[PDB]
Ligand binder design. Structure first.
Ligand SMILES: O=P(O)(O)O[C@H]1[C@H](OP(=O)(O)O)[C@@H](OP(=O)(O)O)[C@H](OP(=O)(O)O)[C@@H](OP(=O)(O)O)[C@H]1OP(=O)(O)O
Ligand SMILES: Nc1ncnc2c1ncn2[C@@H]1O[C@H](COP(=O)(O)OP(=O)(O)O)[C@@H](O)[C@H]1O
Ligand SMILES: [Mg+2]
Length: 217
């Protein structure tokens, strides 16, 4: 009956839908995530179509969301919090990696504040499952840079504070397919400027990934 979905991070009840390609995410504290999906739909629908998993509907307090891992034989997933945290400053200055597929193998700890060097090392660890075909893992990095670039650009013209939103990086083991999308709108707020904190997180990730795509080992 109820099949639990293998979350990489967060603390929310998320199960597979009774149907292919869907996950059900419980809104625990309020329905603010629903309000914010709806708001983004009416005000920035281009942003919603390019960067956010499809919201198919609502069932009581469950959101029926597109499963970002569905079209993948062997998905590797990384959750990076790019929005402001509630209290804590970010474990990597401008963002916090919250988890990744096989993070336990590398003694990853989401409470550990990291140097630039540890941060880069953890992202390399997340890429390890993509294997030795060096000039093909960098195709994955470059496609991520392509979308993160457009996202950082588009974020300048969006009057929301993306408190607590994450980037979900995905690539298949065979490196044939990858994507990144914005998730978790539960704490997103209206404002009358753009979100320089969140933009700074994206540009910083664009910087790290660019260094990875370019270094010659
Ligand atoms: O589960 P995450 O995505 O890492 O985010 C959590 C989550 O925030 P929300 O649930 O409001 O999004 C926690 O709430 P719980 O799941 O623990 O109920 C909260 O813990 P507190 O409510 O006790 O503040 C914690 O915040 P923090 O660790 O800053 O106190 C915060 O983590 P972030 O710091 O990454 O926002
Ligand atoms: N649309 C999605 N498709 C696939 N996995 C998802 C999707 N949304 C969330 N996840 C997974 O769930 C985890 C937590 O989701 P998130 O929306 O951030 O919930 P929370 O509010 O509990 O932090 C992510 O780390 C990711 O692994
Ligand atoms: Mg989250």
């Amino acid at each position: 009956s109820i099949r639990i979905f293998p979350r990489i991070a967060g603390r929310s009840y998320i199960i597979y839908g009774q149907t292919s390609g869907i996950i059900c995410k419980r809104m625990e504290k309020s329905d603010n995530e629903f309000v914010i999906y709806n708001y983004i739909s009416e005000h920035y629908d281009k942003f919603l179509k390019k960067y956010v998993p499809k919201l198919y509907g609502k069932n009581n307090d469950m959101l029926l969301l597109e499963d970002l891992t569905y079209n993948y034989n062997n998905p590797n997933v990384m959750d990076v919090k790019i929005g402001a945290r509630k209290r804590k400053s970010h474990t990597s200055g401008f963002f916090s990696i919250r988890g990744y597929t096989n993070s336990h193998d590398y003694k990853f700890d989401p409470d550990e504040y990291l140097t630039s060097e540890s941060t880069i090392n953890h992202i390399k660890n997340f890429m390890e499952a993509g294997g030795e075909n060096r000039d093909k893992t960098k195709q994955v990095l470059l496609k991520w840079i392509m979308k993160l670039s457009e996202l950082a650009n588009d974020l300048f013209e969006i009057n929301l504070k993306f408190d607590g939103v994450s980037l979900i990086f995905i690539y298949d083991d065979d490196c044939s397919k990858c994507d990144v999308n914005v998730v978790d709108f539960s704490r997103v707020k209206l404002i009358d400027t753009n979100d320089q904190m969140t933009i700074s997180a994206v540009t910083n990730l664009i910087k790290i990934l660019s260094e990875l795509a370019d270094n010659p080992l």
